[PDB]
Structure formats: C-alpha cells, structure tokens
C-alpha cells in the first residue's frame, strides 16, 4: 500500500526528471504518466496530475505553436505535444464536470489556474478559459474560486495587447447571457481589472556574416517600427471591442434591474471617460429613468451621475445635460435614508456602507469648483442636519465636519435659514437674515459623546 504509493511517486519523479533533461526524446513518458494517473489511488492521481502540470509548463514553448528533420520533426514534435496537452485538458473537464473528491477537484482547479497564468498564449486557451469560467458561473462560490479570479485578474493586468483579454471578456459575456446577467458581484469586478481600459571581446564574424548581420539589423528596425504602429492600432481596436462587450453587458444588467446594479454602475462610472462624447449625454438618461433597496439604487444613480460630470474638461466640452435633476434626487433621498435603519456590523460607486457614498457624494459636491456655497449649500445642509437625528455619531460628526472644513463662511445652516426651495417640505423662513435648533436636541442622545460634539460645534 504505502510502499506501492512511494514506488509510484518515485517512478513519476524519475519520468519527470528525464523529461526535464531531455524533453524532445521522451514523449512516450507523458503517456506513461497518464497510465500512472489511471491508478485508483486518489493521492497518486493528485501527484500524477501535478507532475503533468509541472511537465507541461516546463516543455510548453513561450510562443504560439503555428499549426500545419530541422522543421519536419519539430512539427511532428509539436503536433505530438499538442495531442497530450489536448488529452490532459480532456481529462480536466471530465474531472471538473464530475463534481475526498473535493480535494481532487481543488487540485484540478489549481492546475487549471496554473495553466491559465502561464499557458494563456498557447493553443487550446479557448477551452481552458471556458472550463474555468464555467466553474465561476455557478450560483455558489465553488472551491478555488479565489484562485481563478486572481489568475484572471493577473492576465487582464499583464495583457497589454488585449487579445487574451478580449477572449476572456467574450467568454465572460457568454456566461452572463447564460446566467441572465445573474452572477456573483466579484465577477463583474473582473472587467475593472482590464489593463487596456485602465491605461488611460565581440565574437568574430566573417565578411559574409557582417553583411548578413547588417541586413538583419535593418529588417529588425523596420519590423519594430511597423510592429509599434500595428500594436497601437490593434490595442485601440481591441479596447473599442472590449468597451462594446462590457457596456452591452452593463446596460443589459440595468434593464433586468437585478441585484447586480451595484457592480454595473461601478463599471459604468469607471469606464465612462473611455466612451464617446455623444454617449456621455445619453448616459445620464438611463440613470435618471429609474426613479419609479429603491433608495439605495437611486443613490448609485445620482453618485455615478456626479462622477460622470466630474470628468475633467467638461467645461470645454459643454455637454450641459442639467444634472440638477440628480441634485434634487439626492436632495429628496436623504429623508428616506434617515427613516430606514442602517448597521455597520463589524469585521457601488467605489465602496460599500451606504453612508460612505453619501459623504462621498457630498465631498465630490464640495470639491466642485465654486459650484456650491451660493446659498444653495446651506439649504442642502439644513436637511443634512435633520437627517442626522439618527445614525452612528462618527457618521453624524462626519457630515457636520464637512461644513466645518467648508470654505463658505455661512453660519446659519444649523439654525433659521434662507428659503428652502427645491421640493420644499421644510421651514423656508424667507428673507430673515438673522445670525441666530437641531444641536439642542442632539445633545440629549444615547451616546454621551454626541453632547460634546454638539458643544464643539456651537463653540467653533
């Protein structure tokens, strides 16, 4: 038993070692490893699979094998090599689809990730990617999911050309149609990792050799210049197609109005600056058409609308579009947020914890160059204090800190204030102008530190 397992492991090690020393001459050993893998023992199956993974990654070329002794035998060698690689992959989907056995499946996922990270450029990558994404498309996080998404994320970062990323994006999009755009939120975060979008003495030479060396050097320089231009154009075209597939998936997700609207707006905000100007004007229409977790969704729409308008140079590109409809939506949405409860527990625009966007929308609102503090901020801040009647003090202190560090010198925000227009539903007090409410009641509250927070506000 144990002796037999040890003997098989030694045989695999010897065969693997011989392959590393002389890979071309020992192709039959790979078939022997497959026979060894056929052994009933689960542990021997794991070791044989790992050795096959180690053997394949060591002998696989760094280039893509062009399909069909110096050239003929190499072709037969490469054609022969592709056959085990296909057979090894064929076993991979068999064991993956077949899902003690859990450990073997985790190992099967592991070698799949290793092939993804290293053998992405190689042939059969379409099958390799399809098998891996099929595991992620499931409703529950299957084991090794963290490994696969990390491998996919790493490829998206390293892939400067974007051809491999385009293949994965297409496969991911196909799963979304199969899943009706209902997948884990981590899956949509893969599109955010696309680097293409985020980019925004001497040995002696004979008299004949010197002329050959000069002639090759001229070709290489000409090759490099043309390749650079072709690379720039191909990357640009790949970026366009990736945006086409990604945005069509996001818009489909918005149409279904599922629970993945959070990740869709995340991607839309991140990739909005990559899209055409004409689409920027029509982008806010879809955001503002969803007004009939409803409060949470409206928060995403107004925040993303702010982010899209926050793009640099919008002053030069006067697309207008009157984001005031989103402004009044945020102006009205604070009251239901104060009405419903919220819990941070303990240990989507850009983050989580809904209160975080609100201050984030407020701080980008403040960061707007002179767009506020024209007697409109005070009207907004009044209901901000009204909405501050509940929620943790650190949140309450945060919003009061925003007006504390505010450059505007208005001081009547927490007291009687100018006309509260724009949907009203509050004390207008028109034409008052008196430097003379909420902090008085805020002093009496469950946490003792709110009292001193109110005191520090009135003293400051």
């Amino acid at each position: 038993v144990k002796q037999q397992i040890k003997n098989d492991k030694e045989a695999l090690g010897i065969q693997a070692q011989q392959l590393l020393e002389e890979p071309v001459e020992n192709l039959h050993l790979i078939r022997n490893i497959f026979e060894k893998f056929d052994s009933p023992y689960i542990t021997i199956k794991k070791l044989s699979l790992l050795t096959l993974l180690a053997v394949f990654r060591d002998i696989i070329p760094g280039y893509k094998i062009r399909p069909l002794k110096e050239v003929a035998q190499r072709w037969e060698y490469e054609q022969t090599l592709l056959k085990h690689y296909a057979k090894f992959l064929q076993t991979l989907e068999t064991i993956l689809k077949s899902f003690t056995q859990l450990s073997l499946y985790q190992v099967a996922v592991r070698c799949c990730t290793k092939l993804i990270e290293q053998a992405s450029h190689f042939n059969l990558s379409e099958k390799l990617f399809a098998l891996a994404v099929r595991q992620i498309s499931h409703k529950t996080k299957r084991p090794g999911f963290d490994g696969i998404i990390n491998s996919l994320k790493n490829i998206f970062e390293e892939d400067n050309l974007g051809k491999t990323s385009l293949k994965c994006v297409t496969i991911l999009s196909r799963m979304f149609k199969q899943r009706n755009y209902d997948v884990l939120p981590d899956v949509y975060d893969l599109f955010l990792s696309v680097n293409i979008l985020n980019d925004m003495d001497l040995p002696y030479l004979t008299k004949k050799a010197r002329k050959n060396y000069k002639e090759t050097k001229k070709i290489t320089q000409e090759m490099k210049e043309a390749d650079a231009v072709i690379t720039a154009q191909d990357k640009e075209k790949y970026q366009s197609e990736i945006l086409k597939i990604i945005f069509i998936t996001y818009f489909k997700t918005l149409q279904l109005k599922g629970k993945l609207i959070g990740n869709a707006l995340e991607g839309v905000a991140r990739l909005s600056h990559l899209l055409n100007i004409e689409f920027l004007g029509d982008l806010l229409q879809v955001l503002r058409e969803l007004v009939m977790q409803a409060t949470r969704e409206a928060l995403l729409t107004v925040s993303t609308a702010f982010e899209i308008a926050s793009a640099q140079g919008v002053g030069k590109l006067n697309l207008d579009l009157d984001l005031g409809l989103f402004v009044q939506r945020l102006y009205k949405i604070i009251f239901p947020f104060s009405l419903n409860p919220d819990a941070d527990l303990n240990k989507v625009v850009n983050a989580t914890t809904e209160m975080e966007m609100l201050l984030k929308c407020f701080q980008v609102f403040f960061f707007k160059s002179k767009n506020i503090s024209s007697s409109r901020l005070s009207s907004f801040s009044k209901r901000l204090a009204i909405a501050s009647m509940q929620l943790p003090e650190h949140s309450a202190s945060a919003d009061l800190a925003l007006l504390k560090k505010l450059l505007s010198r208005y001081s009547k925000l927490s007291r009687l204030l100018t006309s509260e227009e724009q949907i009203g539903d509050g004390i207008y007090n028109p034409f008052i102008e008196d430097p003379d409410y909420e902090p008085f009641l805020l002093k009496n509250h469950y946490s003792p530190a709110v009292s001193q927070s109110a005191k520090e506000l009135l003293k400051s």
Binding site: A130, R134, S137, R174, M175, Q178
Partner: peptide, 15 residues
C-alpha cells in the same frame, strides 16, 4: 445547463 454550444450571417461593410 451551462453548455456553450453556440451561424450564417452577413456584415454590410461596403458602400
């Protein structure tokens, strides 16, 4: 229930 079994078409590219 996740099979990627997915024809003839045409792409109008000429004037």
């Amino acid at each position: 229930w996740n099979s990627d079994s997915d024809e003839n078409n045409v792409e109008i590219v000429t004037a």
